[PDB]
């Protein structure tokens, strides 16, 4: 059974957060110039395309990306539809079967345009954390750039999720995949000092 | 149990790069004190830093870019073998291993293993290795050094021949803390539309 790509393409047309570094890939040394190889240079914000946050992003004493447990980003995941909801909390999630789930991906179907930064997204309410924590959920993923509203500076959801040991994955592309169980892979790069990492997220149907 | 094991080089500002190539840089542009909410970071690097894959574009102007690459190649059963104390590695040195049904192969040269220094000399792969591995069904080869060709070679025989036989390339895996044998491997490139390679997080789990 094939792996399916649920990552946003990364190129110089991708959207970023306002005030983040624009994405740049450029060929530093071409093959004409080097005599052998095309060699690339990559400049970006960590939070561009499909990626994971580390606690250090929103907490000065938080863990950096390399201090994170890799076991969390690989394994069984459940995918659910939570479209047409302004916000998502305990109430909206109690209707789903979630027993023994370790990793949960939410399809909001809210945006899905990797080249535009949205004006508004559905966010997670802070009661979601104790609820998911209690069920054993270590990772939550959403198909939008954030778990908190776009203009919120408190980042309640970020803080609460990581206080309950739930890790965060943003900007997965879920419109071409059905609800259900899969294996997930979405590993961060081994960055010693970083606040997050882009990843290649992929899934395979159980 | 059966935990995944990291076989990637740590990426930080002391990592080595190819001579004259973009040095690696992770830096906080705007801190949480300054912004009132978030540490805002910037990542600058060469593609060919730390553990990473090559795409055919890197050495062929008409080669595929990273996103054109088949992801199924970079996930699945792999075999690890020890080829230390060899100046070069070809058919001859691999014929002593039983390699039937293998799709992905990792070679421990134990030649260098210092992520913070760029080596003066490495063991390279000879070009006869490609038909040999190709015939057996091998789609990916990995080495614990920065290149499959010698550090100063401009022809890049090994690169060209590997990809001409549909064998993909993974460089700078860290193998000294892992035993030979069978594993599941994961080493996926980032979804880079226009790039000549991608860094990866390579990990393995014992079968
Ligand atoms: C930097 C890089 O990728 C490179 C440059 C010269 C020769 C071989 C290489 N892999
Ligand atoms: Mg052309
Ligand atoms: Zn983020
Ligand atoms: Zn976030
Ligand atoms: Zn390379
Ligand atoms: Zn190479």
Numbering used by the authors:
A (entry chain B): 4 to 209
B (entry chain A): 3 to 209
Paper text:
The proteins involved in tryptophan catabolism are in general highly conserved across species, but with the notable exception of the second enzyme in the pathway: kynurenine formamidase. This enzyme catalyses the conversion of N-formyl-L-kynurenine (NFK) into formate and L-kynurenine. Our attention was drawn to the prokaryotic KFase KynB (EC 3.5.1.9). The KynB subunit, approximate mass 23 kDa, comprises just over 200 residues with about 50% in 12 β-strands and 15% in four α-helices.
Highly ordered structures of BaKynB and a complex with 2-aminoacetophenone at resolutions of 1.9 and 2.3 Å resulted and confirmed the binuclear Zn2+ environment. We also investigated 2-aminoacetophenone given chemical similarities to part of L-kynurenine. This ligand provides the aromatic component of substrate and product and primarily lacks only the 2-amino-4-oxobutanoic acid moiety. Formate did not elicit any spectroscopic change but L-kynurenine and 2-aminoacetophenone gave comparable Kd values of approximately 60 and 50 μM, respectively. However, the characterization of a BaKynB–2-aminoacetophenone complex structure at 2.25 Å resolution provides a suitable template to inform on aspects of molecular recognition in the active site. Key to ligand, and by implication substrate, binding is the interaction with Trp20. The 2-amino group forms a hydrogen bond to the Zn2+ bridging water or hydroxide. In this respect, the complex derived may closely mimic the configuration at the completion of the catalytic reaction and immediately prior to the replacement of product by the incoming substrate for another round of catalysis. An intramolecular hydrogen bond between the amine and carbonyl groups of 2-aminoacetophenone appeared to be significant. Therefore, such an intramolecular hydrogen bond probably defines or constrains the substrate conformation, and orients the scissile bond such that the formyl moiety would be directed over between His60 and Ser149.
